[PDB]
Amino acid sequence: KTHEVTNQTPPITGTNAYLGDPLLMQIAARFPKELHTELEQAGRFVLSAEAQDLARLANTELPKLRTHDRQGRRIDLVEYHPAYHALMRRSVAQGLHSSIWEDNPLESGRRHQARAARFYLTAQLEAGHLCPLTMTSASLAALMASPEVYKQWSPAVLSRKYDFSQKPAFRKQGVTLGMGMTEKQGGTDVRANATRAEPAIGGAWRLTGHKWFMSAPMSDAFLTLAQTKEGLSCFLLPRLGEKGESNGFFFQRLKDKLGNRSNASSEVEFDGALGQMIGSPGEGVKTIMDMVTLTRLDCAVASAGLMRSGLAEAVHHSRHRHVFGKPLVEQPLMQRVLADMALDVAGATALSMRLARAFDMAASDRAEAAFARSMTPVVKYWVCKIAPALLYEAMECLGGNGYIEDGNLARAYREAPVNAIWEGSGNVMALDVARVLSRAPALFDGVLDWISGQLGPRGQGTIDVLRAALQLTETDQGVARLLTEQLAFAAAAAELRQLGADDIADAFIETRLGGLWRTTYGMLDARHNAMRIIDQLYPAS
């Protein structure tokens, strides 16, 4: 041999991602014991060596579109690696697509939070297959606009048996649902959709057009927007007909994507595809409003989990990798970088779960409903859009191996932009935040009141900043991103206080609410012990 291999970091595999995360455990502290037991088992699974192999395979053995069979007939099939189906099977059995719609007494009053904690853990393992599960869970809220259609589909949708066979949906053990919104001329401006729907025999509708981005193409049906005589309408469009034949779907290509690669995203064209209208004619936008809101929470929770998993690897690496004779984690500068990132990961996780809590409490508490209506785009804006910069710095903490695809940080870095881009990007979230202030000032008083209650009298200066930003946004729409980010900082700070993470909150408040312009991590002085921040959030395991 020419050399020895020394000073290598042992893998994080085999430990428990839930029990290694005290902030998450505090977030779940009031869950019933049965949920704690399930989260510990989930925490063990997502760091197991077998699960990590499935995640690597799903993202390297990529889905393939087969437009035709060997004799020249169209079949419009997308084939996946078995690893994809194994992840789907377990997450569907776990109810990640269905549990908020189920009647489970152990989760009463906690359905969004219980699911969000599971979602957060799974996103640390493999994020791509979460897309069909997010769309399936959220799609049922659109189906509520037509209760007969909900009653018809929900038994099949809520089934916890995953079924990827090419049977018609009504013969499958369970079904999944997708979304056909974006067209080539725009995904934001859905009223510019040119897909058209025309009445057909039997009260159905026939659709002709295209959708430029349709993820999870082997879903059994798709919520789709199309124009009718009275405006943009929403439809439930099955991929297959009752005998299993194609329903006018023509897949053109799969996207060659930066990340999210385990999840096939197709370009599709429709020729006479038959479907049911969902909601009132011309009310397509209103019909899908609650569906989109549900996907935005998932985008935040998953981005937070992505950041958590990437930073845990950086902290763990620092504890074992020696440089100049001692572990990297004993270097003051590495301590400041790791602790500074931990503050944002902590704030993003607390805020994302606080939004889930507002969803659970909205029906019984007007102030929580106010938070739920107005802050979903704030949380999606900030949590998702900080992930690329933070995951890059976490990757840099690994040195050269961090840049190599046989690890996890490269894949997570490639993944991070998708949650921010996939549905409403930053500018769309921020304008949404400003519109709600223009139409419902009372909602932001309620949020400001919750923030002020948690920060206490010392936080009144932050409240004044937020009011000034709200008022300035009415003067100038261009400052809507400033308003959105400041709201997120303040709400994350408030929740860290609510959770009792007072050392974390102190340092978070001093920097994000009191510090100066910065562009890189590590902007902490010695006033707060950095090693304590790191040990509190990433205890050595």
Ligand X SMILES: Cc1cc2nc3c(=O)[nH]c(=O)nc-3n(C[C@H](O)[C@H](O)[C@H](O)COP(=O)(O)OP(=O)(O)OC[C@H]3O[C@@H](n4cnc5c(N)ncnc54)[C@H](O)[C@@H]3O)c2cc1C
Query: What is the separation, in whole angstroms, between the first and last Cα of the chain?
Result: 33
When asked if residue 509 is in the footprint of ligand CAC (CB under 6 A), the reply is no
215 among the known binding-site residues? yes
Q: Residue 80: which of 264, 254, 266 has the closest Cα? A: 264
485 among the known binding-site residues? no
Q: Residue 64: which of 51, 76, 73 has the closest Cα? A: 76
Collect all residues with Cβ–Cβ distance below 8 Å to 422 and sequence separation of at least 6. 131, 260, 299
User: According to CB under 6 A, which one of 179, 499, 524, 530 is a site residue for ligand CAC?
Assistant: 499
Query: H-helix or E-strand containing 311?
Result: helix 289-320
The listed partner (a copy of itself, ligand CAC, ligand X, none) that binds 299, CB under 5 to 8 Å by sort, is none
- Does residue 426 contact residue 420 with C-beta atoms inside 8 Å? yes
Max CA pair span of the chain: 79
- Does residue 97 contact residue 91 with C-beta atoms inside 8 Å? yes
Alpha-helix residue ranges (DSSP H) falling in 321-330:
none
Closer residue to a copy of itself, CB minimum distance, 198 or 476: 476
| Residue type at 223 in one-letter notation | L
When asked if residue 161 is in the footprint of ligand CAC (CB under 6 A), the reply is no
Give 239: exposed, middle or buried? Use CB within 10 Å, 0-12, 13-18, 19+. buried
- Least separation, in Å, of the C-beta of 325 and a copy of itself? 8
109 among the known binding-site residues? no
The listed partner (a copy of itself, ligand CAC, ligand X, none) that binds 164, CB under 5 to 8 Å by sort, is none
User: According to CB under 6 A, which one of 42, 46, 135, 169 is a site residue for ligand CAC?
Assistant: 169
3-class state of residue 247 by DSSP: coil
Collect all residues with Cβ–Cβ distance below 8 Å to 147 and sequence separation of at least 6. none
Closer residue to a copy of itself, CB minimum distance, 37 or 477: 477
99 among the known binding-site residues? no
The listed partner (ligand X, a copy of itself, ligand CAC, none) that binds 169, CB under 5 to 8 Å by sort, is ligand CAC
Look-up: residue for tokens 């620092």?
318
Closer residue to a copy of itself, CB minimum distance, 67 or 425: 425
Question: Which listed range, 20-28, 31-39, 243-251, 358-366, lies at the site for ligand CAC (CB under 6 A)?
Answer: 20-28
Q: For residues 352 and 504, what is the distance between their CA atoms, to the nearest angstrom?
A: 16
Interface with ligand X (CB under 6 A): 178-182, 186-189, 211, 213-215, 257, 260, 265, 321, 323-324, 328, 331, 333-334, 396-397, 399-400, 403, 418, 421-423, 425, 427-428, 431
The listed partner (ligand X, a copy of itself, ligand CAC, none) that binds 217, CB under 5 to 8 Å by sort, is none
The token duo for 319 is 């504890």
When asked if residue 153 is in the footprint of ligand CAC (CB under 6 A), the reply is yes
Which residues in 262-281 contact ligand CAC (CB under 6 A)?
A: none
72 among the known binding-site residues? no
User: According to CB under 6 A, which one of 504, 507, 524, 530 is a site residue for ligand CAC?
Assistant: 504
The listed partner (ligand X, ligand CAC, a copy of itself, none) that binds 297, CB under 5 to 8 Å by sort, is none
| Residue type at 174 in one-letter notation | G
The listed partner (a copy of itself, ligand X, ligand CAC, none) that binds 215, CB under 5 to 8 Å by sort, is ligand X
User: According to CB under 6 A, which one of 9, 15, 19, 22 is a site residue for ligand CAC?
Assistant: 22
Q: Residue 396: which of 413, 417, 418 has the closest Cα? A: 413
User: According to CB under 6 A, which one of 387, 501, 507, 530 is a site residue for ligand CAC?
Assistant: 501
When asked if residue 529 is in the footprint of ligand CAC (CB under 6 A), the reply is no
Q: Residue 88: which of 43, 112, 55 has the closest Cα? A: 55
Q: How far is CA 480 from CA 84, 276, 363, 431, 505, in A?
A: 39, 38, 29, 6, 25
Closer residue to ligand X, CB minimum distance, 296 or 354: 296
- Least separation, in Å, of the C-beta of 481 and a copy of itself? 4
Q: How many residues are listed for the chain in this entry?
A: 541
User: According to CB under 6 A, which one of 58, 138, 156, 302 is a site residue for ligand CAC?
Assistant: 156
When asked if residue 170 is in the footprint of ligand CAC (CB under 6 A), the reply is yes
- Does residue 278 contact residue 204 with C-beta atoms inside 8 Å? no
Q: What is the DSSP letter of 538?
A: S
Q: For residues 381 and 281, what is the distance between their CA atoms, to the nearest angstrom?
A: 31
Q: How many CB atoms lie within 10 A of CB 245?
A: 9
Q: For residues 528 and 287, what is the distance between their CA atoms, to the nearest angstrom?
A: 49
187 among the known binding-site residues? yes
- Does residue 90 contact residue 82 with C-beta atoms inside 8 Å? no
The listed partner (a copy of itself, ligand X, ligand CAC, none) that binds 522, CB under 5 to 8 Å by sort, is a copy of itself
- Least separation, in Å, of the C-beta of 344 and ligand CAC? 14
- Least separation, in Å, of the C-beta of 346 and ligand CAC? 7
The listed partner (ligand CAC, a copy of itself, ligand X, none) that binds 499, CB under 5 to 8 Å by sort, is ligand CAC
266 among the known binding-site residues? no
Residues that bind ligand CAC (CB under 6 A): 22-23, 26, 152-153, 156, 169-170, 175, 499-501, 504, 536-537
Binding-site residue numbers for FAD are 179, 181-182, 187-188, 215, 321, 396, 400, 423
Binding-site residue numbers are 179, 181-182, 187-188, 215, 321, 396, 400, 423
